[PDB]
C-alpha cells in the first residue's frame, strides 16, 4: 500500500510535460507506466503484483519491430497520462484506469504492416476482422492477457464496472485505426463550431475518447525535433519492409512504402502533419484547451520538416 514508485528528479519533472521522451533504458518502462497509473488514477486502483504481471506480459506481446513496439505502447500511455493530468476533472474513476491500460495494449501483437497489407495478403486476421483489422486484434490479446491466472487488474470492479471498463478499452483501441479518425474528427468539428458538444452524452464522450486515442498514438510528432526526426526512421523502416512486401506479391506500392522514393519523404511529411496531424491536435485542443502544448509542438515540426526542403537541413 504504502510503496510509492519514485523517478530521479529529471524524471520526476519532466515525465509530467507533454514532450517527454522515455528514454532508451528499456528496464526503466514498466516502472514509468506503474508511476504514472499511480498519480493519475492512485495506488490503489490496481494491485501492484498483478499490475506488474499483467505491464509484463504486455511487453512480451510487443513484437521486435522497428516502431510498432513496447516503446511505442509506453510512450503512447505516456501521452494520455499528460492529458488526463492536465483535464483532473472532466474524466471518471472508470475512464482513468481504462485509458492508461487501453494506450499499453493498443497495438499488442503489431507485425509492422497496415490493415491494407494483411487484407492484400489475404492474411487470416483479415477473414476474422474485415475492418479494423489489427485494431481488433489488438484488443482481442488484451482481453487473452487479462484472462490469463494473476492478471485480471480488474477483479475488484462490479461486473457492470467491469463491462463498462472493458468497453471504454475496446471503443479506445479501435479508434486507433485512423481510417476511423478523418469521419471522428469531422463530427467533433462540426459539434464543436455548432456549441452541440455534451460530454454528458456518452457518444459524444466516446468521439472525444477516440480523438485522444489518435492524439496519443501520433505523439511522436510531439516531441522536440530531435526525437521526431529519430522516430521517423523507426516509422519509414516499417513502411519501406511493407513496400517490400508489397513488390512481392507484384503490386507496386504508394510511394509513402517505396524505399526507391526515400526522396519524397520530407513532402510526404508535410502532407500527412497537414492532413492528419494539425486538424487532430487542432480539434483536441478546441475541446481540451490544455492539450495545446501538444498543437504547438506539432506545429514546430512542421516548420522543420519545411526546413528540411528548403535545404536548411
Ligand atoms: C496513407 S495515410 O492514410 O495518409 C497514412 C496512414 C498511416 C500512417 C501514415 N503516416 C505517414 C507518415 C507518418 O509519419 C505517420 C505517423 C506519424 C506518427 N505516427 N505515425 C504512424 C505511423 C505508422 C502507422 C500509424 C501511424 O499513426 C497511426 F496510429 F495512424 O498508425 N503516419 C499515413
Ligand atoms: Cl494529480
Ligand atoms: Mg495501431
Ligand atoms: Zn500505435
Redesign the pocket.
Given at each position: 500500500g504504502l510503496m510509492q514508485f519514485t523517478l530521479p528528479v529529471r524524471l520526476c519533472k519532466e515525465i509530467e510535460l507533454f514532450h517527454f521522451d522515455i528514454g532508451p533504458f528499456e528496464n526503466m518502462w514498466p516502472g514509468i507506466f506503474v508511476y504514472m497509473v499511480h498519480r493519475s488514477c492512485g495506488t490503489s486502483c490496481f494491485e501492484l503484483e498483478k499490475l506488474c504481471r499483467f505491464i509484463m506480459s504486455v511487453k512480451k506481446n510487443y513484437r521486435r519491430v522497428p516502431?510498432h513496439n513496447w516503446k511505442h505502447a509506453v510512450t503512447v500511455a505516456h501521452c494520455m497520462y499528460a492529458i488526463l493530468q492536465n483535464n483532473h476533472t472532466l474524466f471518471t474513476d472508470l475512464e482513468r484506469k481504462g485509458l492508461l491500460i487501453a494506450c499499453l495494449c493498443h497495438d499488442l501483437d503489431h507485425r509492422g504492416f497496415?490493415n491494407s497489407y494483411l487484407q492484400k495478403f489475404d492474411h487470416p486476421l483479415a477473414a476474422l476482422y474485415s475492418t479494423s483489422t489489427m485494431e481488433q486484434h489488438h484488443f482481442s490479446q488484451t482481453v487473452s492477457i487479462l484472462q490469463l491466472e494473476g492478471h485480471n487488474i480488474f477483479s475488484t470492479l462490479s461486473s457492470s464496472e467491469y463491462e463498462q471498463v472493458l468497453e471504454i478499452i475496446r471503443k479506445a483501441i479501435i479508434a486507433?485505426d485512423?481510417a476511423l479518425y478523418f469521419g471522428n474528427r469531422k463530427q467533433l468539428e462540426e459539434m464543436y463550431q455548432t456549441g452541440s458538444l455534451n460530454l454528458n452524452n456518452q457518444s459524444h464522450r466516446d468521439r472525444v475518447i477516440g480523438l485522444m486515442m489518435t492524439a496519443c498514438?501520433?505523439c511522436?510528432?510531439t516531441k522536440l525535433w530531435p526525437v521526431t526526426k529519430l522516430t521517423?526512421n523507426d516509422?519509414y523502416a516499417?513502411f519501406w519492409a511493407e513496400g517490400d512486401e508489397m513488390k512481392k506479391l507484384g503490386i507496386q506500392p504508394?510511394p509513402?512504402m517505396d524505399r526507391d522514393k526515400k526522396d519524397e519523404v520530407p513532402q510526404?511529411?508535410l502532407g500527412?502533419y497537414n492532413?492528419?496531424a494539425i486538424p487532430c491536435y487542432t480539434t483536441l485542443t478546441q475541446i481540451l484547451p490544455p492539450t495545446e502544448p501538444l498543437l504547438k509542438a506539432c506545429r514546430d515540426n512542421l516548420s522543420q520538416w519545411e526546413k528540411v526542403i528548403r535545404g536548411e537541413e
Open positions: 516502431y497496415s486507433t485512423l498514438d501520433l511522436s510528432v521517423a516509422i516499417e504508394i509513402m510526404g511529411q500527412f492532413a492528419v
